[PDB]
């Protein structure tokens, strides 16, 4: 396991159509370091409470916005697989990738995220 975040980030988000869709967690891998190696086979797990969430990968210059629903949710932990991300992204090659974020879908009380990690698979 590789920990990308633990703590408690809250994000509020009532509706699309406004100016800001905020992240409960996000990183910009062109600038910020991360131990997670996207060329290996991986899963991303997020511990959370509240609104349903999506995982986003985005590349600003191909206009790519891969947006993924959890593979499953048990015990307040969401799981996202490489295979899912790839399918949404168009490809399993992530060179050029600009943006990874965990975002809530529209709701009244928002979402709280306590942990974000990645796991390597065989
Ligand atoms: O190159 C610009 C890029 O540079 C960065 O520096 C900047 O930080 C980025 O913000 C910016 O990219 C633009 O980001 C916004 C969202 O920005 C948020 O996330 C990134 C953060 O950096 C920033 O701080 C945040 O505020 C994008 O707009 C959002 O796009 C998504 C996804 O949809 C877009 O891409 C996929 C394509 O298929 C779509 O056609 C395209 O719009 C939207 O999410 C979708 O929302 C709809 C419902 O909303 C729609 O219907 C209702 C209407 O009122 C609303 O206006 C409509 O959009 C859902 O059905 C989908 O499920 C969901 O995916 C967001 O709504 C939209 O705000 C820019 O597109 C991106 O260029």
Alpha helical stretches, state H, 1-122 = 82-89
Nearest CA to ligand 1 atom 44: 16
For position 81, which CATH number holds? 2.60.120.1070
Atom of ligand 1 nearest to the CA of 67: 64
**Among candidate residues 6, 7, 10, the one with its CA nearest the CA of residue 104:** 10
Alpha-carbon span 2 to 96, nearest angstrom: 22
Tokens representing residue 113 in the block:
């995220």
Alpha-carbon span 119 to 45, nearest angstrom: 8
HSE-CB of 119 using CA atoms within 13 angstroms: 11
3 state DSSP class of 83:
helix
**Among candidate residues 67, 73, 27, the one with its CA nearest the CA of residue 49:** 73
Distance 34 CA to ligand 1 centre (A): 24
Q: Which residue's entry shows tokens 């910009």?
A: 28
Tell me 88's DSSP state: H
Straight-line distance from the first to the last Cα atom of the chain, in angstroms, rounded to the nearest whole number: 13
Q: What is the CA radius of gyration of the chain?
A: 14
Count of structural domains within the chain = 1
Query: For the chain, how are helix, strand and coil distributed in percent, rounded to 5?
Result: 5, 50, 45
Distance 14 CA to ligand 1 centre (A): 15
Resolution for the entry shown, Å: 2.3
């Amino acid at each position: 396991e590789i920990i990308l975040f633990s703590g408690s980030n809250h994000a509020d988000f009532k509706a699309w159509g406004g100016d800001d869709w905020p992240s409960a967690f996000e990183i910009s891998p062109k600038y910020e370091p991360m131990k997670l190696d996207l060329n290996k086979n991986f899963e991303i797990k997020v511990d959370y409470n509240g609104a349903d969430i999506v995982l986003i990968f985005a590349r600003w210059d191909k206009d790519i916005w891969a947006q993924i629903s959890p593979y499953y949710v048990v015990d307040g932990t969401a799981v996202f697989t490489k295979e899912q991300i790839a399918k949404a992204y168009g490809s399993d090659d992530f060179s050029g990738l600009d943006y990874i974020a965990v975002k809530p879908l529209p709701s009244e009380e928002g979402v709280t995220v306590t942990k974000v990690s990645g796991i390597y698979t065989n």
